[PDB]
Design a protein around this nucleic acid. Structure first.
Ligand SMILES: Nc1ncnc2c1ncn2[C@@H]1O[C@H](COP(=O)(O)OP(=O)(O)O)[C@@H](O)[C@H]1O
Ligand code: BEF
Lengths: 97, 78, 855, 103, 95, 97, 87, 105, 93
DNA sequence: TATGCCCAGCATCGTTAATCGATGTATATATCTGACACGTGCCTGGAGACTAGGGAGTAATCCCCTTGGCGGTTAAAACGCGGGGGACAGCGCGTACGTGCGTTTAAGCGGTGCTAGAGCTGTCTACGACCAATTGAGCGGCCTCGGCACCGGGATTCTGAT
DNA sequence: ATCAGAATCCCGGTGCCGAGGCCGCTCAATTGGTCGTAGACAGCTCTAGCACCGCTTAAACGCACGTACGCGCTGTCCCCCGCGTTTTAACCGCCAAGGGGATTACTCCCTAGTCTCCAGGCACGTGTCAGATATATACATCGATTAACGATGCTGGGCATA
């Protein structure tokens, strides 16, 4: 059959809210951070735990700021997020330079 | 390697955030948000690393850089 | 500029129930409405359907609503009593008394002739009304002001005639004149007579004024310190020729008192004070100088203390020479804005009239020393030497005249204290506050005599159930001062005395306002909240001999602020206001000279509290009780015009010099130049006749010589020769020249106009003074009718001929600038500059009237 | 030892050396490490207590960091104290808005 | 070998005093270690700046007391003052 | 007189208040309120003349910035009139809730 | 009447045009109605903490008089750096 | 010379900040070029701040420096606003920022 | 009580860029408390950083990296240039 | 006696010239305030000068913690298609909000009685840091086994569409 | 109201690896004593705040009027979604490997401590120079007024003719 679009996202929320692991892989993120840090400064070596530190530390901001974006969407009587919601959250929080 | 962050990654981050339906051109700017919020932390990591007279990024410098900006992190030393 | 509704005056019915609504107020009642931008004399009885939509309508709606509630409180209420009728009906006559004072003028500020819509120009006066600020000063034409209050018009002309401008003032700054200590009184006190210590104080102020020094008048409150200031200023202006502006700072409460006393004792001097806020400041600025990039039309004014700090640029840009201040206790500290503000005004001499205790702090006496003399200058053992030198050092610069020399006409003085004990409410409010419950430091001192000062205090005493007698019963028994105050008040009511209550706390005055109103005691409060328009009505109502207000409440600073009470005799003080001699000066507002039935004072001392320590500290600070003969061209021409305007100037020369035309010279020189001008004029006329007659004889000889050749036949009759002695003789008869002579450079001076001017003006002075000396407005001519007018655009009868000579009798010939502005003649629209009434065209008519009366 | 005499569990001499070697003040007090050890013992008893209850909410013996996250984020004063704190290997509270329910 | 310092056998005592039948993983063990070190850093720095503002050369018990009162939200501060002053009182009353 | 355009006068007041360097909240109500709250919190307290200025300007700091972020919430919400949900969202994104 | 003057609560000192001018400086065209009532609560929450810290710093300094430096320290502790009055 | 401020070629006192490091209780031992370096950095900071304050005083035709010139001088710069993020200058103001959608159209 | 305040040390720097402008007292307190606050930030950052790497002293490199951290770029670059120029000027003399 | 004719008589209009006064413009002088530089006087921290020793710079060593590749496979990632609830353009509209108005009220500019309190200089005593000695706990390193991780199978639990 | 269907939870089974605990041993905390000293205590010397008092004078609010904007509703456009189909590379684990972080030893250097003055800095009186404000004196230009002069116009007071 055809399930209702949207509720599968809700049960995915129920499944992800109980997980205690990361979501983004470690090799693409390791090549991205290693490439940006390599272009910023040549000859650098990082720690294996630092990948997890920047990993979950980046996920914390990408979850809190994304939740504030979701609340900005709900405030506008809509469910689909927009870039002006993220820019609004960054402008109100004050971190937007 | 900006293409490493695929769509299902930002999708799972959206489900963990609590969104029922997202848009389209959202992860493209989200990679920019993570890039701006990442280049300063990595810059601080290279600063504390280079100032230590050694070329090795450990784990305590990341905790010092995150706690300096106002985002304390536990577990990986402190 | 709009013609809208301002305020509401009176109300009545229009067409000759339980509650009349707004419709009954429209079709059943007419209301007297005062319009804005217009005087109170144009009040019309209008409603709503007679004026339509006009600017401002909610004021009449609220007033009509209060009138509906009033009607519900007169006879449409079963709960009304008897005193409520006298109160609600008393408000009617109260508002009537507050509205009838706006119809009578009080002063004429300016007088500028404005044009109308028909081309004419009428002289309108800037009228100032009674019991009103300088604002709302409307322009009223001179056609009805002289028919209502001629005293203001005559006095307004007297302010312009009595030229007391500062340019005539003497300049003795380089050398002071010879001073003589007088003993009698000058003929300027029109109010009443003075004793001996008043003239002694005037001789002291003028005695020290001649030495270029300043003193402090520290006499007793009531010895006429205000009258001595006005008499000293008047005698200094009219004696030493010091007509310059003198600033006298007076508090706002005492300003109307100083105005009434100033006009009652010295009516010849104006008293334009300084009040208001915004528009009144524009009135004082437009009255101060003329609209040009320096016309001093004032000299003596009254400025409040706050008006100094608010306006320092306006008062600081004007030069002054004398400064007087009443109640100069504000300069207690030398680090105040008023102390440095008064020192900014470039003055010459100062005078401090006060009785402040200069013994509790050395900074007060020293402040009064360096305040007027910049440059001059602890332990108890060295105090006898410090006062042994400073005492006699300051004695020649102070007046210490005690009241022991004036007790021969004053009643006895007495005072009795009363140690009032506390009650249970004062015990719980005196002990339970500094423990646990609250329900800092000064609140205990304020609550040491009356508990009702917070919120949870009235319901705590009332242990039962709205009642009225139980509330007052629980209110009087809460403190001993209320029971003893009611018992002593009843005792004084069994005989008949005027009792006063001086309190520091402003809330206790309202508590007495709620306690004395229930007992049926008619009174009126006096604190620092109501404006001058209300407290002046209250004080003017208390001074009546038939006033039913035997209780009059005051305050500390507002109670002892100023003025005085003559009918009051009993002074009851709740507690000392934390200041020595503040009680002496507070009783000084009632205990005065005019009081005859003695003065009884009761001090409600709080026993076993905290006020007795302050009283002892006040007693500790009380035991210490320690070219002239040179006439230039402008003077010859100006003197010649003075002869053309006044004629003989050997009798009123003092009035013809102080006007600002003749410079300060010797009168003998004016007499000699006058005798030489008149003598040379008569001699020049005599020589003009002796030579003119000879010229006429020569023209008769030549004329006969021409006729001898004319009657013979040697002259052709076809053309008449115009160049013959006959034509020049005929033109000599109608000659167009006058007796001219050059006197000391000045050319074009006629001698016939001087002699004929002295004859005409002398015949006018003898004619008017020989029939009507004290009433020039009743002079007539009889049946002497001159020739009619020669095509004039205005009606002219015999009354215009009789009133026309009055202007020449008062101002003189050629002074048409004051005749056209004189409302006592009626020729307002009959004198102009196209037009028929000219300057010389009417002057020659006046000369024809004088020549007609002489013949 | 001063830890046994003070009646606490956290050390006193070692944290006292941390007050000396940490380079904070010129002098040190006498009852400062005992008071600080008592406060840290109270915070430890509260955090480990709510962590034990959160461990019993899911029928688990050994406490996991997720029990710390659910134990701190569920309280009000603890959430106000640890505002900008991210617990390692944690998560979020099951908070779903009522406007997203299928109605 | 480096002998590192950590609050390992000092937290299990208080853990057994309230839960004598539970355990804790090493990850959250490091989280609690860095948590105690972080609270020690905040209280130490707060007592340092507070001791420097009043021109004081020592940090007694009142500095840590007001540092705990200002660092805690409400009732935890009162319980920390009562328990702390009780521990200092027991330490002073004894040897 | 006439009837000016509603809202333009508000912008004129903005142009007049942007150049102002003083305070807007009156001093006596602020002293009567802050002294009452502090008196109820702790008895027997004395303030300083400068502490009233510090709490005044410091209060108007977040009282103006918070109304600026609230104004951003009203602009993003396709409105022109502020709402209480703009205040709640402002305190949520700010993090001091 | 002239009997008693009850002021009720002192929270009514801040009226409508005051916060209207605050929002005028903030950059708001037209506001609503029930906004200043919650704004007083926002100032209450963002005020009782600063006052509480001021009383704590005052009591800790062996004195019962609030000065100006303790306010600057309390504001700088919460991340509200303020200059002008010392520091 | 005598004082280290004249030998280093700066204007801020070298002995003052050094004594503050000896009294502020921040390190057990101090260096040799730390107060000169910090004095130079602070000299550059106050140099740029007083420069933009001078421009913020000349753009409005003013002589003396007012705190509003410091507020408008710091808020207009990006790096200065990023450095002084959680900073509230007393006796200042805000930037005249009006949204484009708020204009009557 | 002789209080410490940076007064004459601000005029010497102001007259080098603007020898014809004034300064108010409130703004002077803003500059003084500003320099004091920056001193607390740099001294504190160098103190905690000196405590992280087990360093028992604070030289010029700690203030250098503290300046490079508290400032995003330009001010860090010019502050490092002028700072090293001042340290070199003082060491060479 | 009435009616035209001779001889004055002031006011009608216009034009010239002298005079008092207002306006505009220098021109050297006497205040006003606001200083910034100097000398008056005094406080005191930084500097002139030496140094022992403990933290810091550098060389040789350990190794182990981090780098760079290698087959397979597994869940993970990208495209696509009909589509259905979500987003957006647009009108009705009515009650709350902006705009004037009058009156009372409280905020503001100075004063004013003290008075509990801030700073500190007399005074020293318990408070605080350093040095021997020892000794018992903290932690380095390795063994056990059970709470928990993970998969297969049976309930089970909403759930979309009829 | 209802029924087969994907997820989801519970029971049963296997099985897995790291904290608890044991052995030990290292070394910093514990007493005990000595030497250096910080600030608590009362009161001297002030000191701004505790309350209000005089006295304004602009604002807050109830009142009345207009009006307009987001909620509600209508209608239309749309954009990822459930699910099926077609790629796709990270990683469990294994393997080689390599060089810089950490350790220990040798050396070194520079600095807090101490002994011992001196002009920088703080407060304030004194002083002539920027600007700003009149101020006595003089010169040039009218505004308006008044005295003087050219020419009468009827009007009044008398002189030769109907
Ligand atoms: N020369 C005088 N002759 C008669 N009465 C006088 C004289 N001077 C003053 N008074 C009386 O003094 C009263 C005015 O008091 P006043 O002296 O003005 O009070 P203050 O103490 O303010 O000067 C008047 O009522 C008047 O009767
Ligand atoms: F003594 Be007076 F009435 F001023």
């Amino acid at each position: 059959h055809r399930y209702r679009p949207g509720t599968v996202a809700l049960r995915e929320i129920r499944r992800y809210q109980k997980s205690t692991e990361l979501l983004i892989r470690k090799l693409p993120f390791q090549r991205l951070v290693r490439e940006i840090a390599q272009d910023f400064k040549t000859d650098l070596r990082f720690q294996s735990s630092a990948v997890m530190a920047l990993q979950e530390a980046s996920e914390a901001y990408l979850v809190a700021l994304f939740e504030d974006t979701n609340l900005c969407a709900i405030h506008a009587k809509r469910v689909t997020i927009m870039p002006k919601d993220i820019q609004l959250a960054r402008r109100i929080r004050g971190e937007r330079a | 390697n900006i293409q490493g962050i695929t769509k299902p990654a930002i999708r799972r981050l959206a489900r963990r955030g609590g969104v029922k339906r997202i848009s389209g051109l959202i992860y493209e700017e989200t990679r920019g948000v993570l890039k701006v919020f990442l280049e300063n932390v990595i810059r601080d990591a290279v600063t504390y690393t280079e100032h230590a007279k050694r070329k090795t990024v450990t784990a305590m410098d990341v905790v010092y850089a995150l706690k300096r900006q106002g985002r304390t992190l536990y577990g990986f030393g402190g | 500029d709009f013609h809208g509704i301002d305020i509401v005056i009176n109300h009545r019915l229009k067409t000759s129930k339980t509650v009349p609504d707004l419709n009954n107020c429209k079709e059943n009642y007419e209301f007297l409405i005062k319009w804005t931008d217009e005087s109170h004399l144009h009040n019309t009885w209008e409603t709503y359907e007679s004026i339509g939509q006009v600017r401002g309508l909610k004021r009449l709606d609220n007033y009509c609503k209060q009138f509906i509630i009033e009607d519900q409180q007169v006879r449409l209420d079963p709960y009304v009593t008897a005193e409520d009728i006298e109160i609600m009906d008393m408000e009617r006559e109260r508002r009537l008394d507050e509205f009838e004072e706006f119809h009578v003028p009080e002063r004429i500020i300016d007088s500028q002739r404005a044009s109308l819509e028909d081309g004419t120009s009428q002289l309108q006066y800037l009228v100032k009304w009674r019991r009103l600020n300088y604002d709302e000063a409307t322009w009223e034409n001179a056609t009805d002001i002289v028919k209502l209050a001629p005293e203001q018009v005559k006095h307004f002309q007297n302010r312009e005639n009595s030229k007391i401008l500062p340019q005539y003032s003497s300049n003795y700054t380089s050398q002071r004149p010879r001073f003589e200590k007088l003993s009698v009184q000058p003929p300027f006190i029109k109010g009443g007579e003075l004793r001996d210590f008043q003239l002694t104080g005037i001789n002291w102020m003028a005695f020290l004024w001649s030495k270029g020094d300043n003193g402090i008048l520290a006499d007793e409150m009531g010895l006429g310190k205000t009258v001595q200031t006005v008499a000293f200023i008047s005698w200094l202006i009219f004696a030493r020729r010091q007509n310059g502006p003198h600033i006298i700072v007076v508090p706002l409460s005492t300003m109307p008192a100083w105005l009434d006393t100033f006009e009652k004792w010295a009516p010849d001097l104006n008293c334009i004070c300084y009040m208001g806020n915004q528009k009144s400041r524009d009135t004082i600025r437009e009255y101060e100088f003329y609209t040009n990039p320096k016309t001093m039309k004032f000299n003596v004014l009254l400025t409040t203390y706050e008006y100094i700090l608010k306006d320092r640029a306006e008062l600081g840009s004007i030069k002054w020479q004398f400064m007087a201040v009443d109640e100069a206790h504000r300069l207690k500290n030398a680090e105040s804005s008023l102390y440095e503000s008064l020192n900014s005004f470039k003055v010459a001499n100062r005078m401090l009239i006060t009785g402040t205790p200069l013994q509790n702090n050395i900074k007060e006496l020293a402040a009064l020393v360096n305040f007027l003399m910049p440059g001059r200058f602890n332990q108890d053992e060295e105090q006898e030497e410090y006062i042994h030198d400073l005492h006699r050092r300051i004695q020649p610069f102070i007046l210490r005249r005690l009241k022991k020399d004036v007790e021969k006409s004053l009643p006895s003085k007495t005072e009795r204290i009363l140690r009032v004990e506390l009650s249970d409410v004062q015990t719980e409010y005196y002990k339970n506050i500094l423990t646990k419950n609250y329900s800092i430091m000064n609140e205990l001192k304020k609550a040491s005599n009356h508990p009702y000062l917070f919120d949870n205090a009235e319901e705590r005493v009332l242990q039962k159930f709205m009642t009225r007698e139980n509330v007052l019963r629980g209110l009087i028994m809460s403190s001993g001062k209320m029971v003893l105050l009611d018992q002593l008040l009843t005792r004084l009511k069994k005989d008949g005395h005027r009792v006063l209550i001086f309190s520091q706390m402003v809330r206790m005055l309202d508590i007495l306002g709620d306690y004395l109103s229930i007992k049926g005691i008619n009174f009126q409060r006096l604190d620092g909240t109501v404006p001058s328009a209300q407290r002046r009505i209250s004080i003017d109502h208390f001074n009546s001999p038939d006033s039913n207000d035997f209780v009059f409440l005051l305050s500390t600073r507002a109670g002892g602020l100023g003025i005085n009470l003559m009918t009051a005799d009993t002074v009851v003080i709740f507690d000392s206001d934390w200041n020595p001699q503040a009680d002496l000066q507070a009783m000084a507002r009632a205990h005065r000279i005019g009081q005859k039935n003695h003065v009884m004072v009761y001090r409600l001392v709080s026993k076993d509290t905290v006020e007795e320590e302050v009283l002892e500290r006040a007693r500790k600070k009380m035991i210490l009780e320690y070219d002239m003969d040179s006439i230039g061209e402008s003077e010859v021409r100006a003197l010649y015009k003075a002869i053309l305007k006044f004629g003989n100037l050997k009798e009123i020369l003092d009035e013809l010099i102080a006007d600002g035309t003749l410079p300060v010279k010797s009168f003998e020189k004016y007499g000699e130049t006058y005798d030489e001008m008149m003598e040379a004029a008569k001699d020049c006329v005599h020589e003009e006749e002796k030579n003119r007659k000879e010229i006429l004889e020569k023209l008769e000889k030549h004329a006969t010589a021409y006729r001898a050749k004319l009657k013979s036949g040697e002259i052709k009759a076809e053309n008449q020769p115009k160049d013959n002695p006959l034509t020049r003789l005929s033109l000599k008869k109608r000659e167009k020249k006058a007796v001219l002579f050059n006197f000391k450079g000045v050319k074009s001076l006629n001698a016939e106009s001087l002699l004929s001017r002295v004859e005409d003006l002398k015949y006018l002075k003898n004619l008017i003074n020989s029939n009507y000396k004290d009433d020039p407005l009743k002079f007539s001519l009889g049946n002497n009718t001159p020739k009619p007018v020669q095509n004039w655009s205005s009606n002219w009868t015999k009354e215009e001929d009789e009133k026309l000579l009055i202007g020449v009798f008062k101002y003189g010939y050629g002074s048409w600038t004051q005749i056209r502005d004189d409302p006592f003649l009626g020729i307002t629209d009959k004198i102009f500059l196209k037009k028929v009434p000219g300057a010389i065209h009417l002057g020659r008519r006046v000369d024809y009237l004088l020549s007609f009366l002489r013949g | 030892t001063r830890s046994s005499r003070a009646g606490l569990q956290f050390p006193v001499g070692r944290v006292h050396r941390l007050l000396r070697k940490g380079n904070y003040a010129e002098r040190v007090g006498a009852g400062a490490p005992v008071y600080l050890a008592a406060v840290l013992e109270y915070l430890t008893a509260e955090i480990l207590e709510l962590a034990g209850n959160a461990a019993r909410d899911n029928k688990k013996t050994r406490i996991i960091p997720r029990h710390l996250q659910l134990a701190v984020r569920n309280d009000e004063e603890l959430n106000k104290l640890l505002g900008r704190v991210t617990i390692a290997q944690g998560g979020v509270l099951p908070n779903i808005q009522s406007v997203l329910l299928p109605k | 070998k480096t002998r590192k310092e950590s609050y390992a056998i000092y937290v299990y005592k208080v853990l057994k005093q309230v839960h004598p039948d539970t355990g804790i993983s090493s990850k959250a063990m490091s989280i609690m270690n860095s948590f105690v070190n972080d609270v020690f850093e905040r209280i130490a720095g707060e007592a340092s700046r507070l001791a420097h503002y009043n021109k004081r050369s020592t940090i007694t018990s009142r500095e840590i007391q007001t540092a705990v009162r200002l660092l805690l939200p409400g009732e935890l501060a009162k319980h920390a003052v009562s328990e702390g002053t009780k521990a200092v009182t027991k330490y002073t009353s004894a040897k």
